[PDB]
Structure 1
Amino acid sequence: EPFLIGVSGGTASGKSSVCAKIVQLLGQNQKQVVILSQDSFYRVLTSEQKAKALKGQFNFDHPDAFDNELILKTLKEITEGKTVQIPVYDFVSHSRKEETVTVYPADVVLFEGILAFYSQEVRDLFQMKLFVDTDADTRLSRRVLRDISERGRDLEQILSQYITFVKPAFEEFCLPTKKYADVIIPRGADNLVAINLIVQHIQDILN
């Protein structure tokens, strides 16, 4: 049975880097590990919803924006040792592509996303839940640079979409889930002492 860990936190808090660090420190001193991200499981937009998204009028930080049924199904079979296929989604296009990614059974499975703990059925599947905590302006400055490079978008649009959707959804949806975490990590990936404790806690659950 795979030991799967939920990881959450606000945007640009360092969730994906925290898991990458967990793998790198797990490999030294072979348990096989795979990292899935909730951003892969965005919903299939209709043409109306797609038009709203191009007008900047769609909330992609709302729980309903994620294919929670597919997340629950994909995670369910992973816990049952099966091989799963994982969608690939294009943030620029807001489309789920036809190609998928094969994920073979592993010993540890990190699932990363801003709302990984929102759904109770999904939440109870994680044997361990981590919440990454980072200063808001630090996250925003990472968010702004990331969104300029990763999608070539305008600065006035990033800041207006942040204030309209990202920040309110963080406070209404993501931040309340912090109470479900087993370990809260301040300073994100820079908290190597916290990560070390987590890594050794994983290693001795597997022994």
Structure 2
Amino acid sequence: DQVQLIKRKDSGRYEIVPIEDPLSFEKGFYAVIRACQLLAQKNDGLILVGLAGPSGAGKTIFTEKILNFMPSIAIINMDNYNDGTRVIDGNFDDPRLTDYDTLLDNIHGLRDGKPVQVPIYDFKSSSRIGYRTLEVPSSRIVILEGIYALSEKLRPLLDLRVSVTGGVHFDLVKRVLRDIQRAGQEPEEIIHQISETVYPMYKAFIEPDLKTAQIKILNKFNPFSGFQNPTYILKSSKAVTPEQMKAALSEDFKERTEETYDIYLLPPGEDPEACQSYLRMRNRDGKYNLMFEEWVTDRPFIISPRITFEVSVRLLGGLMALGYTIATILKRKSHIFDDDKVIVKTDWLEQLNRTYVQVQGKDRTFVKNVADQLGLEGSYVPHTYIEQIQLER
């Protein structure tokens, strides 16, 4: 866990000695920071670091923790370089989406001290809406975050190669194992087969690049952390109009609309309409998210950690190949007001032909008073949407 520098023979720049031992999320967080400090004191110019790893391993939350510790750094999200015309699919896992011509030009300009126009990608329209002007930051540290941030095209230009593995990405594999394990099976062999089925590109395209990392971080998923800081939800049957919400709420509440489609999956086996731990596949604005449905009911609140990570549609096929079955499909249209801390929204679900008001946020006191500000007392429904259709059979 001691960061040490060694001159790379291909140039005069120094490099981090590889740390073969995998490192914790907290320990790796400090190892990366101290490595950048030593690299900045011994090499001139841009300090470019590639943060690679699968979706859900925790590379996104890793970047935003470094940003909060050091606002002087800049984060470049490699998915903003996507070009949808290159593939006929819509899988974000695809390594053929990235426009390496724009990416390599941007980093070469930043190395020469020039500001560059880094693209901005909208997944809803699957197109490049525009560009943003990125200058070399004060700390001259730039983090390139993406699944293939350690690709062969980028490794020569990277100063530090960091990989993140595990997280909810691996926890799903263990969750599937809990659901489908049979007696006499060697658990590690099944885990390997689950990963091949549910993550059909990890072993081939993603993992080999991760092995070249100099700081290997293994984020162990904590089941108890989600309930420490969960999401508190109040659902109402009242008819609070979006016009009423706009006036009642502060001008800090941004207004937006969206359409979502949720696929509820049941584990294989015989759950007699009870003991049912659903897996939810959510489609929203060109992205698929897999959600764990772990709910508690403190009337009138319904509480859940809302653990989710981005997945491909291929994951749905893999889960069904492993015995998971589709219980129902819920299509809704929503009008959302977001304080960036508290969300007030109205959802219309086709299957119920009903409109409900939802106030959600991580601060329980904020959620309750905002619902009280809208006069929602006496109209609360302390049930999940999937539970409501079950109740209304």
What is the TM-score normalised by the length of structure 1?
0.65
Match for residue 166 of structure 2 among 134, 149, 173: 134
Work out the CA distance in 1 between the residues paired with 2:141 and 2:221.
Answer: 19
Match for residue 102 of structure 1 among 126, 133, 146: 133
What are the residue-to-residue correspondences of 1:20-169 with 2, within 5 Å?
20-26=64-70, 32-45=72-85, 49=87, 52-53=88-89, 58-97=90-129, 99-106=130-137, 107-118=140-151, 120-135=152-167, 136-138=169-171, 167-169=199-201
- The Cα shift of 1:62 comes to 2.5
Q: Indicate how the Cα distance of structure 1 residues 132 and 44 shifts in structure 2: closer, same or farther if over 3 A, else same.
A: same
Larger helix percent: 1
Question: Residue 15 of structure 1 aligns with which residue?
Answer: 59
Q: Indicate how the Cα distance of structure 1 residues 170 and 25 shifts in structure 2: closer, same or farther if over 3 A, else same.
A: same
Question: Which protein has the larger Cα radius of gyration, Structure 1 or Structure 2?
Answer: 2
- The Cα shift of 1:24 comes to 2.8
- After superposition, the CA RMSD in angstroms is 2.8
Q: Indicate how the Cα distance of structure 1 residues 17 and 176 shifts in structure 2: closer, same or farther if over 3 A, else same.
A: same
Q: How many residues align?
A: 155
Q: Deviations over 1:163-197 (max 9, x none)?
A: 9998222221111111210101111798xxxxxxx
Residues 85 and 101, structure 1, Cα contact 8 Å, conserved in 2 = yes
Q: Deviations over 1:95-141 (max 9, x none)?
A: 111x21111111100000001112x231111111110111434368x
Q: Indicate how the Cα distance of structure 1 residues 139 and 43 shifts in structure 2: closer, same or farther if over 3 A, else same.
A: farther
Residues 71 and 122, structure 1, Cα contact 8 Å, conserved in 2 = no
Residues 171 and 221, structure 2, Cα contact 8 Å, conserved in 1 = no
What is the TM-score normalised by the length of structure 2?
0.36
Work out the CA distance in 1 between the residues paired with 2:164 and 2:127.
Answer: 28
Q: Indicate how the Cα distance of structure 1 residues 41 and 188 shifts in structure 2: closer, same or farther if over 3 A, else same.
A: farther
- One-letter identity of the residue aligned with 1:103: L
Residues 61 and 170, structure 1, Cα contact 8 Å, conserved in 2 = no
- One-letter identity of the residue aligned with 2:80: S
What are the residue-to-residue correspondences of 1:162-177 with 2, within 5 Å?
167-177=199-209
Residues 13 and 139, structure 1, Cα contact 8 Å, conserved in 2 = no
Q: Indicate how the Cα distance of structure 1 residues 173 and 77 shifts in structure 2: closer, same or farther if over 3 A, else same.
A: same
Q: Indicate how the Cα distance of structure 1 residues 187 and 164 shifts in structure 2: closer, same or farther if over 3 A, else same.
A: closer
The runs of 4+ residues in structure 1 deviating greater than 6 Å are 163-166
**SS of equivalent residue, structure 1 residue 6:** strand
